[PDB]
């Protein structure tokens, strides 16, 4: 499942992923409130807050 | 009734309160995931993600 | 038993800890004006001035 | 996905979500007679009586 | 709860706190005519005459 | 309801009243962002920024 970022996000932790509004990412794991994902744009990966994204 | 910011937070919504790690604020309402607060650093008011702060003594 | 730093502190000795405002640490010993603690971020241990931190309550 | 409140509602339980007439809220879950919602006005969450709101 | 000083006060005992009109403090204990409090700016603790402050 | 000033304020317009932090004033109108108030100290009347004052409990 691919999701789109609704808002910009600054990585707080180290295992965190930095994305911007509009970015598309592939959800690798739906761990809980925090999901593992890979950016389709930058190619980098990490955890993202699930409340900042929407399922396409 | 005061909290200290554990991380930086830039307001996303319009009534959101921006704050920097270390900032002290007075909690106005403890309403779940979002709390209403008064900043002692900037003097502004707004909502804050409760998981970004720690209630202290 | 955890506290959060209210201000930045530069270690003046070898046995005490350096921390920045907003940092969280575990208090190992509450012995006087100086407390032994462990930074939750770096795991580092040392003494901290008790007046620079506030207990999470 | 969003509904507008037709009447004022006082929570009868601790999990309920109180609101006023006209308030807009996002419906999180449509579990029958009681729906889980997030208020756009107060940002709070809880269950609301589904016959008290209208879907837009 | 937090209070704000209505008037300037000069400490008389060794236990009471000195504060200025407008200062905000956190009430630690509401021990009658003399409440224990903590200045928010100086973090210093001590007793204050309750009739000199207004609870917000 | 009566309010207490959290910060100092200096009147820019001609209808709003200046007040020092600590000043008590009666809220005449809670007209949005700018409340109408009468100062219990200066006895004057005028508008005040609502975010500069706190409500008495």
Curated annotation (Swiss-Prot), chains B, C, F:
Q: Which tissues show it?
A: Detected in monocytes and neutrophils (at protein level). Expressed predominantly in cells of the myeloid and B-lymphoid lineages. Highly expressed in granulocytes. Detected in tonsil.
| Highest taxon in the source lineage | Eukaryota
> What is known about its induction?
Up-regulated during myeloid cell differentiation. The highest levels are detected in fully differentiated phagocytes. Up-regulated by IL2.
Localisation per UniProt entry: Cytoplasmic vesicle, Secretory vesicle; Cytoplasm, Cytosol
Its post-translational modification remark reads: Phosphorylated on several tyrosine residues. Autophosphorylated. Becomes rapidly phosphorylated upon activation of the immunoglobulin receptors FCGR1A and FCGR2A. Phosphorylation by the BCR-ABL fusion protein mediates activation of HCK.
Domain named SH3 is located at 1-57
According to the entry, the disease involved is:
Aberrant activation of HCK by HIV-1 protein Nef enhances HIV-1 replication and contributes to HIV-1 pathogenicity. Aberrant activation of HCK, e.g. by the BCR-ABL fusion protein, promotes cancer cell proliferation.
Family that this chain belongs to: Belongs to the protein kinase superfamily. Tyr protein kinase family. SRC subfamily.
Function (record text): Non-receptor tyrosine-protein kinase found in hematopoietic cells that transmits signals from cell surface receptors and plays an important role in the regulation of innate immune responses, including neutrophil, monocyte, macrophage and mast cell functions, phagocytosis, cell survival and proliferation, cell adhesion and migration. Acts downstream of receptors that bind the Fc region of immunoglobulins, such as FCGR1A and FCGR2A, but also CSF3R, PLAUR, the receptors for IFNG, IL2, IL6 and IL8, and integrins, such as ITGB1 and ITGB2.
Spell out the subunit comment.
Interacts (via SH2 domain) with FLT3 (tyrosine phosphorylated). Interacts with VAV1, WAS and RAPGEF1. This interaction stimulates its tyrosine-kinase activity. Interacts with ARRB1 and ARRB2. Interacts with ADAM15. Interacts with FASLG. Interacts with CBL. Interacts with FCGR1A; the interaction may be indirect. Interacts with IL6ST. Interacts (via SH3 domain) with ELMO1. Interacts (via SH3 domain) with TP73. Interacts with YAP1. Interacts with ABL1 and ITGB1, and thereby recruits ABL1 to activated ITGB1. Interacts (via SH3 domain) with WDCP.
UniProt domain comment? The SH3 domain mediates binding to HIV-1 Nef.
Tell me the protein's name: Tyrosine-protein kinase HCK
Please report the organism this UniProt entry assigns to the protein: Homo sapiens (Human)
Instruction: Name the gene behind this protein.
Output: HCK
Q: Which residues of the full protein are shown?
A: 81 to 137 of 526
